[PDB]
């Protein structure tokens, strides 16, 4: 339970929009992860940001996603641009909350985003 997320806009390929994991308060973390899954394929990774400053991206998403962390509103924002129809999926925010030394990410919450010309 604890945290939560929803929202998102359906846009045409080549657009730009800001996915936001809507904040649920101040939570202890060291790694925020944007992650995407579409039916018919293995659930794949998008990008991780680190409280220290480390930033990792998947190989297929270069130059199209920008990840940023806002510690006042404690939310991670993904600005997505130059879209192609392979991003049609639902996007999840996985946490890092230390459980025994890390684990139990709260990626239950999802945001369905489909990019299409029609």
């Amino acid at each position: 339970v604890q945290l939560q997320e929803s929202g998102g806009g359906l846009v045409q390929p080549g657009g730009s929009l800001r996915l936001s994991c809507v904040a649920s308060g101040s939570v202890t973390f060291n790694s925020m992860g944007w992650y995407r899954q579409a039916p018919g394929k293995q659930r794949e990774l998008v990008a991780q940001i680190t409280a220290g400053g480390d930033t990792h991206y998947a190989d297929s998403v270069k130059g199209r996603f920008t990840i940023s962390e806002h510690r006042g509103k404690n939310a991670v924002y993904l600005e997505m641009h130059s879209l192609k129809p392979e991003d049609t999926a639902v996007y999840y925010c996985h946490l890092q909350v230390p459980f025994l030394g890390g684990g139990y990410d709260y990626w239950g919450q999802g945001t369905q985003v489909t990019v299409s010309s029609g």
């Binding site: 939560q4 997320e5 929803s6 039916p39 639902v90 919450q109 999802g110 945001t111 369905q112």
Partner: protein, 49 residues
């Protein structure tokens, strides 16, 4: 003098009920609208949450 006659109160205009819809769509189309269905012995159950 000054006398107190009655008491005045504001009445609610419209009643509003909201529970959190907040979620994803739901995996139903892939079950009912699926092209192929499993056999009656290799049973296909899809999990929904």
């Amino acid at each position: 003098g000054i006398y107190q006659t009655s008491n005045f109160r504001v009445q609610p205009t419209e009643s509003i009920v909201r529970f959190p819809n907040i979620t994803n769509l739901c995996p139903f189309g892939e079950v009912f609208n699926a092209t192929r269905f499993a056999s009656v012995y290799a049973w296909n159950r899809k999990r929904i949450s």
